[PDB]
Write a protein that binds this ligand. Structure first.
Ligand SMILES: OC[C@H]1O[C@@H](O[C@@H]2[C@@H](O)[C@H](O)O[C@H](CO)[C@H]2O)[C@H](O)[C@@H](O)[C@@H]1O
Ligand code: CA
Length: 769
């Protein structure tokens, strides 16, 4: 490996061998069908709300999130980079697809597949990823840096449906070598959203944009139809000329054939036919190819950028609504703008690299923090783009000031912005994209007093329940299968209108969002204040026994939705205390004296009784009325965790909080698989995992990272990082279960998982508060 020195990969990048087989991979531990796309994954490409594309460590474009809210794992084999090399003096060169695999049928059989093992590495530090190619049959060593411009405090480039591939080629040998790099792409119009005639009308055109010191050559792969529909738009691939390279192209090769129309050209001398051909296809799949060829002398390095864009302006949800995607603000809505997007990237990618470096540098340069922590901190952010992210710029046929946003809970449980989850998972948004975060919370504010008295069948018990109760915060803002933003509470497995954590978590999120954006946004507090008061006032009505605290009902009625709480719980109780303290402080800021007094009175009563009911001398009991009420819950003081972040002070005595956190580390972490797998949710006081429900026996990745942040704030530095380390290890390490770029909600002691690609572990960003 002589190429690594010619590029700049951070030491904290996650690494794996190209073509590496992973032997320890976990699988779902549930009885019901659940997504398992295996461990062949990579960091995604694409902006927020753009649709994303997962290019895996083996090189394939395989995890398709272009249909917003859907996960489709299938390798489109025509989409590749390939290389040709010929040593000066030799009669023949070699050509190789840079993909560690081969197609499953006979399409593209002429191409040279099966990039060999032990011949290159993949690296990722989101939003960047890299491949290096160090192959005994390729004398010139190559590397590529690929990324999209995901940039904190930037709502423009961060939305773009674009990727850059910055190639570096170096000749360490003593002979001249001719080298070509070729990007192939299938015209994927009709891959989704089209009910018949999936390739019909697809056609490819070549754009040559020549100006002074700028030559771009690109293929635009579109359809003859000018219809404005979810399926229609354009893909583009292209390259920018640099000194010492020549560009060649082929407009049209058949992807549903053996590929020799292209490969007989590329494999001879790495130079394509430059054949334009705008003939639309009928049934055949078609694709385009863009190549560069250059001669490298001994010791010479060359850099050359390629790009990919996709202009698919319309997202459609299963309930029928069609929306424009956010990036259309910057490029237009007609779906004929892929070249403009590509050109912007090829002319500005160096600026974008610097902008990414500028935001990663404060963390990467901090030599007090271990590299593993940096690996997880940046790579968990993959989910912000890869979580079915929807970001609208108008309803089709509709202008408003704001752009509504939603991130999925996950794909298995297809609900936008699930609030009990976003309490943990929204840290990156408030910290890095706060205008999105505040927009989401206004979306929730607007739902508080919505009443939908139409009844739905509850999945878990078959009862009928009201869809949405006035004054109760919704579980979610809809499903991609139905109507995001319009029809809330798509979750129907249980009735969220009786949950005891949603209304408190809502208030805590509101005040968090004020505090972590500098305590200056009084307008945001004003917008949300009525909803805050309503939410707490409704929750107060659920106090059955007048101890000042809402009663859990002995059926799951909170985020641990199979782990029943009854009476006063540490979890819902502490969240309630913190929410009351938050509302007092908002009352003070907004000069609402009567609200301040009321919530102060409720707080003092509830605080006294919480302590009396639950403090046992070592930790806070799980609850007051359950069969294993004395279980040690990892998340028992979630309200105090948030109170620390919100600078609300002590809701419980410092001594008791410290004792409780030490007990959780000693038991839920260190007595669970030697503290190498995170914090198990429930442990009995005898040091045996609580078996009352599956959730008690799970580690929740997002709960564990949040607990680590709580420990860190409380000065338990070693315990914090040791607790988080087990989550990192399981997700990323060779000794773990292969969950990189699909971090799950949960695992059990055997390492098997529930709900890959989950929002909650974005809570790792609470460790950066
Ligand atoms: O892991 C806890 C989270 O569980 C989620 O519930 C899932 C449902 O959404 C899905 O429809 O069904 C499965 C199987 O019954 C549930 O696990 C909730 O959406 C989250 O609120 C909850 O925290
Ligand atoms: Ca009560």
């Amino acid at each position: 490996d002589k190429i690594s020195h010619k590029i700049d990969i951070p030491d904290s990048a996650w690494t794996i061998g190209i073509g590496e087989k992973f032997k320890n991979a976990g699988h779902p531990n549930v009885k019901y069908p659940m997504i398992d796309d295996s461990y062949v994954q990579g960091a995604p490409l694409g902006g927020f709300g753009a649709g994303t594309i997962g290019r895996t460590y083996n090189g394939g474009f395989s995890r398709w999130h272009l249909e917003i809210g859907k996960n489709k794992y299938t390798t489109v084999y025509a989409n590749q980079f390939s290389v040709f090399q010929k040593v000066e003096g030799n009669k023949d060169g070699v050509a190789q697809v840079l993909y560690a695999g081969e197609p499953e049928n006979g399409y593209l059989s002429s191409w040279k597949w099966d990039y060999p093992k032990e011949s290159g590495m993949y690296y990722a530090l989101y939003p960047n990823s890299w491949y290096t190619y160090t192959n005994k049959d390729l004398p010139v060593q190559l590397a590529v840096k690929q990324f999209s411009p995901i940039i904190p405090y930037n709502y423009k480039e961060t939305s773009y449906p674009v990727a850059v591939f910055k190639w570096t080629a170096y000749n360490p040998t003593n002979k001249n070598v001719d080298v070509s790099i070729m990007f192939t792409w299938q015209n994927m119009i009709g891959f989704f959203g089209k009910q018949v005639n999936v390739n019909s009308g697809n056609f490819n055109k070549i754009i040559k944009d020549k100006s002074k010191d700028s030559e771009i050559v690109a293929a635009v792969m579109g359809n003859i139809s000018n219809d404005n529909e979810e399926w229609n738009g354009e893909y583009s691939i292209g390259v920018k000329k640099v000194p010492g390279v020549d560009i060649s192209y082929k407009a049209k090769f058949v992807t549903t054939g053996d590929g020799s129309d292209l490969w007989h050209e590329f494999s001879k001398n790495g130079i394509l036919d430059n054949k334009d051909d705008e003939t639309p296809t009928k049934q055949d799949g078609i694709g385009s190819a863009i190549a560069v060829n250059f001669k490298l002398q001994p010791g010479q390095t060359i850099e050359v950028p390629f790009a990919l864009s996709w202009d698919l302006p319309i997202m459609k949800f299963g309930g029928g609504d069609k929306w424009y995607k956010m990036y259309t603000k910057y490029f237009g809505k007609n779906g004929k703008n892929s070249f403009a997007i590509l050109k912007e990237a090829l002319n500005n990618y160096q600026k974008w690299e610097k902008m990414i470096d500028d935001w990663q540098k404060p963390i990467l340069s901090n030599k007090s923090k271990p590299d593993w922590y940096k690996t997880a901190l940046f790579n968990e952010l993959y989910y912000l783009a890869d979580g079915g992210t929807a970001w609208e710029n108008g309803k089709v046929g509709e202008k408003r000031t704001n752009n509504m946003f939603g991130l999925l809970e996950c794909f298995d449980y297809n609900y936008y912005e699930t609030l009990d989850v976003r309490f943990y998972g929204s840290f990156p948004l408030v910290m890095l994209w706060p205008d999105i975060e505040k927009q989401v919370m206004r979306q929730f504010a607007d739902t508080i007093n919505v009443q939908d008295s139409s009844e739905f069948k509850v999945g878990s018990n078959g009862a009928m329940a009201v869809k949405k109760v006035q004054g109760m915060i919704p579980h979610d803002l809809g499903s991609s299968y139905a109507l995001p933003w319009i029809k809330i509470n798509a979750y129907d497995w249980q009735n969220p209108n009786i949950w005891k954590d949603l209304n408190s978590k809502y208030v805590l999120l509101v005040y968090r969002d004020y505090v972590l954006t500098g305590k200056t946004d009084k307008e945001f507090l004003k917008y949300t204040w009525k909803s805050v008061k309503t939410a707490l006032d409704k929750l107060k009505e659920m106090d059955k026994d007048n101890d000042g605290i809402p009663d859990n009902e002995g059926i799951p009625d909170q985020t641990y939705n199979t782990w029943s709480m009854k009476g006063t719980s540490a979890y819902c109780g502490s969240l309630w205390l913190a929410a009351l303290k938050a509302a007092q402080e908002i009352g003070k800021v907004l000069k609402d004296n009567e609200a301040y007094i009321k919530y102060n009175e409720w707080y003092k009563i509830a605080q006294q009784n919480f302590e009396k009911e639950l403090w046992n001398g070592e930790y806070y009991n799980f609850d007051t009325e359950s069969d294993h009420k004395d279980s040690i819950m990892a998340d028992q003081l979630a309200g105090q965790w948030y109170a620390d972040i919100l600078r609300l002070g002590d809701i419980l005595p410092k001594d008791h909080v410290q004792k409780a956190l030490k007990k959780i580390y000693e038991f839920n972490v260190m007595k669970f698989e030697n503290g190498k797998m995170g914090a198990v949710n429930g442990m009995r006081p005898d040091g045996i995992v609580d078996e009352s429900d599956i959730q008690a026996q799970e580690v929740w990745t997002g709960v564990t990272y949040a607990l680590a942040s709580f420990m860190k704030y409380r000065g338990m530095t070693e315990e914090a990082y040791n607790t988080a380390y087990g989550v990192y290890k399981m997700t990323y390490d060779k000794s773990g279960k292969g969950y990189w770029f699909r971090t799950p909600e949960a695992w059990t002691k055997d390492g098997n998982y529930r709900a890959s690609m989950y929002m909650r572990p974005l809570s790792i960003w609470s460790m950066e508060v």
